[PDB]
Design a protein around this ligand. Structure first.
Ligand code: OGA
Ligand code: MG
Ligand code: NI
Ligand code: ZN
Length: 331
């Protein structure tokens, strides 16, 4: 078995290897990358996502989200308070302000210590989940707006034609902006490209150990757990590396820098934080190997998780027994 300790793997494809996205994913999996839940892909030196980022300031962040925490430093939830719209240029200035900017630090490890010590005492503002793309239309390799769609993959594998679409999302971050512990919708893959700015630190639980994280989460968030049998689908709970280590939960960590891709694999729980002003682009995707994970994915039916139009068909076809209850949650 390849990668039996489930370490995060880092890949350096050549420009020739960067042509065929599906083939490269399957290569990485042949080497055991999926066992970690997360892999890093450094693009060939010849590649670029676009020519410059000099003209992005007029993108609108219609609903910036202030991430307010509750709990203790290593075990907390966050809720998202909606703020007034602002442009990317306005948000960048805000991220660089004395109130929100990255503190002085020695290295990524020192910054990580500071994040876990102090996150809860601040409420950073995240421009998340903005439909759109920063890839140039002429970028032909690993262009996250030109991937094969999940609907087409389901149709190729299973023969059933379904409605729905699959487009990317932009994320504008600042120091301490936080992504809570989650797997993707329908335990899909994700791919995330850090277009510019400061790093993003990731934490990940190997898919084979995801239920260990879930059991810890039910213990640490006991009211949430009574409310919903899949409350990590709400994407609000944080647990620090120190708490994970104290409870014996297998995990790994890695920092993504500008110009790098990360891939999350089916049922790979992940969480993390931004080091300073940045912009990322991410999208979900599928492969043949996903289908079985899609069929087994948990679902929130309490009403909190509320998701895209396109998840309907995935539930309806892959999980027809759950469909009725899940759809009640959506309506
Ligand atoms: O970058 C973020 O805030 C969150 N991204 C992801 O969870 C991802 O790409 O799957
Ligand atoms: Mg612009
Ligand atoms: Ni994710
Ligand atoms: Zn729920």
């Amino acid at each position: 078995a390849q990668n039996p300790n489930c370490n995060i793997m880092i890949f350096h494809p050549t420009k020739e290897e960067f042509n065929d996205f599906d083939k490269y994913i399957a290569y990485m999996e042949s080497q055991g990358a999926h066992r970690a839940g997360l892999a890093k892909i450094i693009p060939p030196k010849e590649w670029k996502a676009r020519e410059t980022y000099d003209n992005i300031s007029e993108i609108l962040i219609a609903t910036p989200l202030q991430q307010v925490a509750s709990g203790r430093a290593g075990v907390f939830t966050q809720y998202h308070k909606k703020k007034k719209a602002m442009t990317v240029g306005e948000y960048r200035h805000l991220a660089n302000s004395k109130k929100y900017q990255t503190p002085p630090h020695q290295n990524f490890e020192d910054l990580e210590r500071k994040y876990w010590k102090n996150r809860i005492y601040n409420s950073p503002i995240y421009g998340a989940d903005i439909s759109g793309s920063l890839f140039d239309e002429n970028t032909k390799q690993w262009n996250l707006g030109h991937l094969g769609t999940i609907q087409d993959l389901l149709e190729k594998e299973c023969g059933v034609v379904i409605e729905g679409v699959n487009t990317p999302y932009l994320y504008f971050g600042m120091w301490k902006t936080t992504f809570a512990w989650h797997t993707e919708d329908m335990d899909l893959y994700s791919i995330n490209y850090l277009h510019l700015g400061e790093p993003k630190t990731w934490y990940v639980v190997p898919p084979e150990h995801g239920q260990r994280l879930e059991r810890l989460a039910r213990e640490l968030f006991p009211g949430s757990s009574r409310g919903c049998g899949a409350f990590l689908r709400h994407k609000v709970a944080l647990i620090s590396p120190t708490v994970l280590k104290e409870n014996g939960i297998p995990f790994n960590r890695i920092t993504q820098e500008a110009g790098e891709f990360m891939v999350t694999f089916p049922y790979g729980y992940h969480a993390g934080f931004n080091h300073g002003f940045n912009c990322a682009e991410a999208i979900n995707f599928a492969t043949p190997r996903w289908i079985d994970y899609g069929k087994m994915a948990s679902q929130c039916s309490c009403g909190e998780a509320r998701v895209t139009f396109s998840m309907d068909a995935f539930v309806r076809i892959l999980q027809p027994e759950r469909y009725d209850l899940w759809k009640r949650g959506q309506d």
